[PDB]
Design a protein around this ligand. Structure first.
Ligand SMILES: CCCCCCCCN[C@@H]1C=C(CO)[C@H](O)[C@H](O)[C@H]1O
Ligand code: NA
Ligand code: NA
Ligand code: NA
Ligand code: NA
Length: 540
């Protein structure tokens, strides 16, 4: 009976609707070789420990169509049944024409037949192991198999255990900007399509005439976007699930050249091409492995747009990455999915954690525990209302940084401490009230913040009414104050309640008061959900 999942976009805000209401993916993604029945026993325990509500896991073209026309959905059958037993949802990752630029997950009868299914050809005439998006047989074959997967879900997944499908994995090309095959050159050395000229409001011409120095890259992005949109449309005609693409990000400050980064993917410079070329693709999701706050923050800014719901489709599984949940949700993100959350004997350090163990999982579990108890209420407030979210904005002190700290004078030291306390103090404008969020200080008195070791804190705030906020935070202090001068009036906290939602209704457990509200609202590693009511009052 259940309504299809759907991505809603209204008033520049977004919701992923699941079972007729907004939903947050508190996700985990498997390692790349866990897409088989025998591997699932090494996936579920981690998902339970993490408290994730949705599993991202590959479905590979090589596994469903190992011999052309001979489909095998045995893996999908087991996965659906085992996910349902655990009352979790699924995001299937279609690994097909591209997985990290390459056709490794395409069947042997595809990836070993270059004449039928041709590769990118560099300007110098050398071939790269990246399938050309101008290969018409490759598009037809990928589309046919994707359709068979969507028919399987149409017939066998009536309650939508699968809520979303990723189409390909990190498309593009390493080692060239585009295809320079004779086939590609005939399409490049030709008019830009009318649709793209109309949607970007440009003057007609050839790719080189219209886009100049960007022609090669924008050509590759356009042709890959068109390919992915055709696969998406074909699959949606069977079952209209949300579908998205995930991006091998370029560094947003210092990207280098296309082909150094994965050329033609949804990088920040070609989001306009992708949105014009692929209007059937619901969102373009960043895959985040930059560890440093400023770069991560910049990625979250670039990918959150009126035309783009924010979904952190991948993030590293090392400790520093967990706190990015908070800004992701504060931007109205629909989900967050740390990569490599299984015990299949693999670690992707230097991208992720050096060691996979219960402590690795616990860093994410601890932040998920703040959101799970309010997931549906948060998702509704994010979409229909005003939310905020912050993370601790200094990264952990370096080996290098401690050396520079050790060699500093006592004036340079006390100055560094004032500077760190300032950087670890964030202001949020909540309308009539502001919050100040600080990191790494006692739960009593006003010693300045010194940060957590390692960096780890954050906060979420949702506005319930002009003077009332839902607040939860982690290894941080949150303090409220008036946003504007009060002309003679004083202010206080009126009431802080800790509680929970039962059947969508607020249940109070206790009132925070006294020491618990005199020095801000102090959070450790334990979950507390608060409703904070502020008041200004006359003394005249
Ligand atoms: C900050 C430097 C990051 C360089 C990484 C760029 C490519 C990331 N690709 C993703 C990351 C992993 C995690 O191991 C897997 O290969 C995923 O399948 C891939 O989508
Ligand atoms: Na949202
Ligand atoms: Na204000
Ligand atoms: Na203000
Ligand atoms: Na509680």
């Amino acid at each position: 009976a259940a309504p299809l999942p759907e991505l809603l976009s209204n008033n520049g805000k977004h919701a992923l609707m699941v079972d007729g209401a907004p939903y947050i993916i508190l996700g985990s993604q498997t390692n790349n070789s866990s897409n088989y029945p025998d591997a699932l026993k090494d996936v579920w325990p981690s998902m339970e420990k993490m408290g994730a509500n949705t599993l991202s896991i590959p479905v590979a073209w090589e596994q469903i169509e190992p011999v052309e026309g001979q489909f095998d959905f045995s893996f999908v059958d087991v996965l659906l049944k085992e996910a349902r037993q655990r009352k979790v949802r699924l995001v299937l990752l279609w690994f097909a024409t591209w997985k990290n630029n390459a056709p490794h997950y395409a069947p042997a009868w595809v990836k070993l037949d270059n004449a039928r299914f041709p590769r990118v050809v560099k300007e110098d005439g050398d071939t790269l192991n990246s399938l050309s998006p101008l290969g018409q047989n490759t598009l037809a074959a990928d589309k046919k198999a994707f359709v068979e997967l969507m028919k399987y879900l149409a017939k066998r997944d009536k309650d939508h255990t699968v809520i979303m499908v990723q189409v390909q994995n990190e498309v593009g090309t390493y080692g060239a900007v585009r295809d320079y095959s004779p086939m590609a050159q005939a399409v490049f050395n030709a008019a830009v399509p009318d649709d793209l000229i109309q949607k970007l409001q440009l003057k007609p011409g050839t790719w080189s005439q219209v886009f100049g120095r960007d022609a090669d890259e924008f050509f590759h992005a356009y042709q890959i976007a068109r390919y992915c949109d055709e696969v998406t449309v074909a699959g949606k005609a069977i079952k209209n699930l949300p579908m998205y693409v995930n991006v091998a990000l370029r560094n947003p400050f210092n990207p280098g050249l296309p082909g150094q980064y994965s050329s033609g993917g949804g990088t920040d410079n070609v989001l306009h091409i992708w949105k014009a070329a692929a209007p059937n693709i619901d969102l373009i999701a960043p895959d985040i492995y930059f560890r440093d706050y400023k770069t991560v923050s910049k990625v979250l800014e670039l990918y959150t747009r009126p035309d783009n719901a924010l979904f952190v489709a991948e993030i590293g599984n090392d400790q520093p990455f967990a706190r990015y949940l908070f800004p992701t949700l504060g931007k109205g993100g629909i989900g967050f999915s740390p990569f490599g959350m299984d015990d299949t004997d693999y670690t992707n350090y230097p991208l992720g954690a050096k060691v996979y163990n219960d402590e690795t999982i616990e860093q994410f579990a601890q932040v998920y525990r703040l959101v799970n108890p309010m997931m549906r209420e948060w998702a509704r407030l994010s979409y229909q209302g005003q939310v905020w979210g912050v993370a601790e904005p200094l990264d952990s002190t370096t080996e290098t940084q401690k050396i520079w700290n050790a060699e500093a004078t006592p004036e340079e030291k006390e100055q560094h401490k004032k500077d760190r306390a300032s950087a670890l103090t964030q202001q949020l404008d909540l309308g009539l009230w502001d919050a100040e969020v600080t990191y790494g200080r006692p739960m009593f008195w006003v010693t300045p913040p010194e940060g957590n070791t390692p960096a780890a804190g954050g906060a979420l705030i949702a506005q319930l009414d002009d003077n009332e906020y839902l607040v939860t935070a982690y290894k941080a202090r949150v303090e409220f104050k008036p946003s504007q001068e009060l002309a003679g009036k004083k202010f206080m906290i009126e009431r802080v309640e800790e509680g929970r939602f039962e059947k969508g209704k607020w249940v109070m457990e206790r009132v925070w008061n006294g020491d618990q509200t005199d020095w801000g609202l102090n959070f450790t590693d334990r979950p507390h959900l608060l409703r904070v009511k502020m008041a200004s009052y006359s003394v005249q």
